[PDB]
Design an enzyme around this catalytic site. Structure first.
Site, PDB file in Angstrom:
ATOM      1  N   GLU A  48       0.582  -1.141   0.257  1.00 15.71           N
ATOM      2  CA  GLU A  48       0.159   0.200  -0.095  1.00 15.71           C
ATOM      3  C   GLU A  48       1.263   1.504  -0.105  1.00 15.71           C
ATOM      4  O   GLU A  48       0.456   2.160   0.582  1.00 15.71           O
ATOM      5  CB  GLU A  48      -0.756  -0.191   1.219  1.00 15.71           C
ATOM      6  CG  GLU A  48      -1.957  -1.583   1.306  1.00 15.71           C
ATOM      7  CD  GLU A  48      -2.463  -1.421   2.128  1.00 15.71           C
ATOM      8  OE1 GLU A  48      -2.785  -0.151   3.406  1.00 15.71           O
ATOM      9  OE2 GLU A  48      -2.972  -2.353   2.933  1.00 15.71           O
ATOM     10  N   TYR A  49       1.164   1.944  -1.404  1.00 15.01           N
ATOM     11  CA  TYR A  49       1.301   1.484  -2.395  1.00 15.01           C
ATOM     12  C   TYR A  49       2.060   1.549  -3.138  1.00 15.01           C
ATOM     13  O   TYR A  49       2.827   2.384  -3.717  1.00 15.01           O
ATOM     14  CB  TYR A  49       0.006   1.717  -3.159  1.00 15.01           C
ATOM     15  CG  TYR A  49      -1.333   1.714  -2.132  1.00 15.01           C
ATOM     16  CD1 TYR A  49      -2.606   0.907  -2.949  1.00 15.01           C
ATOM     17  CD2 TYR A  49      -1.565   2.783  -1.325  1.00 15.01           C
ATOM     18  CE1 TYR A  49      -3.367   0.902  -2.062  1.00 15.01           C
ATOM     19  CE2 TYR A  49      -3.163   2.043  -0.757  1.00 15.01           C
ATOM     20  CZ  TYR A  49      -3.879   1.687  -1.219  1.00 15.01           C
ATOM     21  OH  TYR A  49      -5.033   0.912  -0.287  1.00 15.01           O
ATOM     22  N   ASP A  72     -12.516   1.756   3.959  1.00 14.90           N
ATOM     23  CA  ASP A  72     -11.686   2.733   4.598  1.00 14.90           C
ATOM     24  C   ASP A  72     -11.869   4.307   3.675  1.00 14.90           C
ATOM     25  O   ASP A  72     -10.376   4.684   3.277  1.00 14.90           O
ATOM     26  CB  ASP A  72     -10.130   2.938   4.378  1.00 14.90           C
ATOM     27  CG  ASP A  72      -9.533   1.731   5.789  1.00 14.90           C
ATOM     28  OD1 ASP A  72     -11.096   0.940   6.537  1.00 14.90           O
ATOM     29  OD2 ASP A  72      -8.567   0.867   5.587  1.00 14.90           O
TER      30      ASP A  72
HETATM   31  C1  LIG Z   1      -5.636  -5.543   3.000  1.00 13.44           C
HETATM   32  N1  LIG Z   1      -5.548  -5.437   3.345  1.00 13.44           N
HETATM   33  C2  LIG Z   1      -6.618  -4.168   4.489  1.00 13.44           C
HETATM   34  O1  LIG Z   1      -7.551  -4.260   4.324  1.00 13.44           O
HETATM   35  N2  LIG Z   1      -5.610  -3.107   4.262  1.00 13.44           N
HETATM   36  C3  LIG Z   1      -5.533  -1.619   5.119  1.00 13.44           C
HETATM   37  N3  LIG Z   1      -7.082  -1.304   5.525  1.00 13.44           N
HETATM   38  N4  LIG Z   1      -4.978  -0.971   5.238  1.00 13.44           N
HETATM   39  C4  LIG Z   1      -5.214  -0.086   6.289  1.00 13.44           C
HETATM   40  C5  LIG Z   1      -5.025   0.498   7.144  1.00 13.44           C
HETATM   41  C6  LIG Z   1      -4.795   0.889   8.615  1.00 13.44           C
HETATM   42  C7  LIG Z   1      -5.084   1.143  10.382  1.00 13.44           C
HETATM   43  N5  LIG Z   1      -4.915   2.279  10.561  1.00 13.44           N
HETATM   44  C8  LIG Z   1      -6.404   3.041  11.738  1.00 13.44           C
HETATM   45  O2  LIG Z   1      -6.911   3.036  10.617  1.00 13.44           O
HETATM   46  C9  LIG Z   1      -5.238   3.707  12.485  1.00 13.44           C
HETATM   47  N6  LIG Z   1      -6.226   5.455  12.373  1.00 13.44           N
HETATM   48  N7  LIG Z   1      -7.642   5.105  12.411  1.00 13.44           N
HETATM   49  N8  LIG Z   1      -8.050   6.314  12.204  1.00 13.44           N
HETATM   50  C10 LIG Z   1      -6.441   6.538  12.025  1.00 13.44           C
HETATM   51  C11 LIG Z   1      -5.451   6.001  11.717  1.00 13.44           C
HETATM   52  C12 LIG Z   1      -4.312   6.803  11.453  1.00 13.44           C
HETATM   53  O3  LIG Z   1      -4.084   6.219   9.710  1.00 13.44           O
HETATM   54  N9  LIG Z   1      -4.453   6.187   8.686  1.00 13.44           N
HETATM   55  C13 LIG Z   1      -4.603   5.719   7.850  1.00 13.44           C
HETATM   56  C14 LIG Z   1      -4.968   5.183   6.719  1.00 13.44           C
HETATM   57  C15 LIG Z   1      -5.446   4.167   5.788  1.00 13.44           C
HETATM   58  C16 LIG Z   1      -6.891   4.480   4.366  1.00 13.44           C
HETATM   59  N10 LIG Z   1      -5.872   5.755   4.156  1.00 13.44           N
HETATM   60  C17 LIG Z   1      -5.341   6.340   4.621  1.00 13.44           C
HETATM   61  C18 LIG Z   1      -5.375   8.145   4.395  1.00 13.44           C
HETATM   62  C19 LIG Z   1      -5.500   8.733   3.978  1.00 13.44           C
HETATM   63  C20 LIG Z   1      -4.520   8.403   5.913  1.00 13.44           C
HETATM   64  C21 LIG Z   1      -4.277   7.782   6.810  1.00 13.44           C
HETATM   65  C22 LIG Z   1      -5.321   6.835   5.833  1.00 13.44           C
HETATM   66  C23 LIG Z   1      -4.020  -0.377  10.516  1.00 13.44           C
HETATM   67  O4  LIG Z   1      -2.873   0.263   9.827  1.00 13.44           O
HETATM   68  N11 LIG Z   1      -3.954  -1.064  11.125  1.00 13.44           N
HETATM   69  C24 LIG Z   1      -5.652  -0.872  12.020  1.00 13.44           C
HETATM   70  C25 LIG Z   1      -6.395  -1.431  10.659  1.00 13.44           C
HETATM   71  C26 LIG Z   1      -6.628  -2.367   9.787  1.00 13.44           C
HETATM   72  C27 LIG Z   1      -7.105  -2.729   8.993  1.00 13.44           C
HETATM   73  C28 LIG Z   1      -8.496  -2.176   8.498  1.00 13.44           C
HETATM   74  C29 LIG Z   1      -8.620  -1.283   9.482  1.00 13.44           C
HETATM   75  C30 LIG Z   1      -7.578  -1.125  10.089  1.00 13.44           C
HETATM   76  C31 LIG Z   1      -3.388  -1.616  12.011  1.00 13.44           C
HETATM   77  C32 LIG Z   1      -3.109  -2.867  12.097  1.00 13.44           C
HETATM   78  C33 LIG Z   1      -3.626  -4.121  13.234  1.00 13.44           C
HETATM   79  C34 LIG Z   1      -4.019  -5.233  12.844  1.00 13.44           C
HETATM   80  C35 LIG Z   1      -3.496  -5.797  11.491  1.00 13.44           C
HETATM   81  C36 LIG Z   1      -3.060  -5.024  10.882  1.00 13.44           C
HETATM   82  C37 LIG Z   1      -2.848  -3.650  10.733  1.00 13.44           C
END
Ligand SMILES: CNC(=O)NC(=N)NCCC[C@H](NC(=O)Cn1nncc1CO/N=C/c1ccnc2ccccc12)C(=O)N(Cc1ccccc1)Cc1ccccc1
Ligand SMILES: O=[P-]([O-])[O-]
Length: 497
Positions: free
Chosen positions: A143-144, A214
């Protein structure tokens, strides 16, 4: 007649592998034994997650990982195949933590695909890991890749796919051949890094699993549904970054493909893919979230939708106020911003103050907590009805979701998806898909079928005239044209015979 794929991530972190156990949910909340034989039957693929790319530029386990306990965990998963001769245990390389632009392993992704020899070494490590641990194929979740890296990434998929094919032939595995997937971007901003080469990216794949979730986050300024199927005019719209990709198209072609602003939705990302030539519908898999995203600081009047808010965006979550009332998993994981469906069900059932609401344009649910100003965007078995009908109607390959441990205990989300695709007694022919905003872009890959009178030489065509010629239907962009369609820029190709 072809079974829809149903691809479910299984995530387990290093500490939990190293202390693996099936009888203490405060050490391992979601052990392999929770995937019952009836769940195993409902899945076509389980995506073990996550492996990485190390500084040797090879696919590797995190080095803190206990190797014997890693094998033990993977063997329990591969043992599930006995209940389902179609089921595959894939493994996945990457994820946000490892592979984001500022992720701890990022440079390794970049360097691994950078040259031919490094791709050969990376590719070999993928197959060798697949064979050594007994996995059934490889999923790449970087990603990505950025536009500069994308030719390297493509080469890397090609070569891995060649090595998967050799290996299927060496193992006689034509009844369940080794497979290659990616987790693809589900919103135009990230998608635009590689969109111009989408046909090349998807050609070596069995499926491109779109992260069509997301799509709202603390990072936007206005609350929104994170996975709306169709658009709500009352919601926010966004710049269509694909109209700036390096496509070499004309102003009319760009404009017709990429309206702007637009509504960030599942439908939009799927049509975005279908527009491109050589991306077949059957390799496109719709991601869905088994979790919601939570906001605070909202003032409704509209259920907390499309409100300014006070949700921290930093990473890690920057304090110990776990404000998401009744979210126990949130306290466990030290973040109130992400709640599993399993937990959201309990929040709604207890006396915690939430109402479940429904947006009939987006076909998605939402919780609202009127007394504290909270808004949660999530998916349930009801939003899955519409997404499943969309999958069948658009002739897509299946559904993918993150992640298995976020289903409730009875596994109802997964049972719902299995049912909407496979149960004889389930009928959605009357399911109303609503009047939310559809994405109407048309590109070379999804021209409608049309008819029109044959082009006639000598005729002076006005603006908007439609003619049929050499297999397509063409329209004049201005008047008065007498050129044969396809021979200069006056004619726009708008449809196919
Ligand atoms: C198959 N792959 C995926 O589904 N990937 C995925 N969803 N990637 C984005 C993941 C961001 C996420 N983090 C967050 O969402 C934390 N957060 N929450 N609100 C804000 C944040 C800070 O991170 N934001 C990321 C983000 C994510 C997507 N688009 C963005 C665009 C602009 C800025 C940021 C983003 C994260 O790193 N974790 C939690 C999580 C994973 C998957 C789905 C929901 C949440 C960590 C993690 C934990 C266990 C296993 C693997 C990964
Ligand atoms: O940050 P971006 O436009 O892939």
């Amino acid at each position: 007649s072809t079974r829809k794929a149903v691809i479910g991530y299984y995530f387990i972190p290093t500490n939990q592998i190293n202390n693996y156990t099936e009888t203490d949910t405060s050490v391992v909340p979601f052990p392999v034994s929770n995937i019952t034989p009836a769940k195993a039957k409902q899945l076509t693929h389980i995506n073990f997650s996550f492996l990485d790319i190390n500084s040797n530029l090879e696919c590797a386990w995190d080095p803190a990982t206990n190797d014997a306990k890693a094998r033990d965990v993977v063997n329990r998963l591969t043992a599930l195949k006995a209940h389902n001769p179609s089921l595959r245990i894939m493994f996945s390389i990457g994820g946000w933590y490892y592979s984001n632009d500022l992720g701890v392993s990022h440079a390794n992704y970049v360097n691994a695909v950078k040259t031919p020899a490094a791709r050969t070494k990376f590719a070999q490590s993928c197959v060798r890991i697949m064979k050594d641990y007994g996995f059934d194929g490889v999923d790449i979740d970087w990603e990505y890749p950025q536009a500069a890296e994308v030719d390297g990434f493509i080469a890397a998929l090609q070569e891995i796919r060649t090595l998967l094919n050799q290996q299927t032939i060496a193992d006689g595995r034509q009844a369940l051949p080794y497979q290659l997937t990616i987790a693809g971007a589900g919103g135009a901003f990230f998608l635009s890094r590689y969109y111009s080469k989408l046909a090349q990216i998807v050609a070596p794949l069995d499926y491109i699993n779109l992260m069509t979730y997301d799509l709202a986050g603390p990072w936007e300024k206005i609350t929104n549904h994170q996975a709306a199927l169709f658009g709500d005019a009352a919601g926010p719209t966004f710049y269509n970054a694909l109209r700036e990709a390096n496509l070499g198209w004309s102003w009319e072609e760009l404009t017709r493909a990429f309206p702007s602003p637009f509504s960030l939705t599942v439908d939009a990302a799927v049509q975005q893919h279908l527009m491109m030539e050589g991306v077949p519908s059957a390799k496109i898999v719709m991601g869905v979230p088994f979790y919601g995203r939570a906001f605070k600081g909202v003032s409704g009047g509209n259920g907390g939708q499309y409100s300014s808010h006070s949700t921290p965006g930093e990473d890690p979550y920057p304090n110990a106020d776990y404000w998401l009332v009744g979210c126990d998993e949130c306290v466990r994981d030290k973040d109130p911003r992400i709640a599993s469906y399993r937990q959201l069900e309990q929040m709604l059932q207890g006396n915690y103050g939430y109402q479940r609401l429904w947006n009939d344009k987006t076909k998605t649910p939402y919780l609202y907590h009127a007394q504290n100003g909270l808004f949660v965007t999530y998916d349930d078995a009801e939003s899955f009805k519409y997404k499943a009908k969309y999958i069948k109607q658009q002739q897509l390959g299946g559904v993918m979701f993150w992640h298995l441990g976020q289903d409730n205990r009875n596994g109802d989300l997964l049972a719902a998806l299995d049912r909407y695709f496979n149960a004889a007694d389930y009928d959605d022919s009357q399911l109303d898909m609503g009047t939310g905003l559809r994405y109407t872009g048309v590109g070379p890959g999804n021209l409608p079928i049309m008819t029109a009178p044959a082009y006639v030489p000598g005729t002076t065509y006005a603006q908007g005239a439609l003619v049929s010629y050499q297999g397509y239907v063409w329209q004049t962009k201005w008047g008065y044209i007498t050129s044969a369609p396809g021979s200069d820029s006056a004619w726009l190709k708008v449809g196919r015979l």
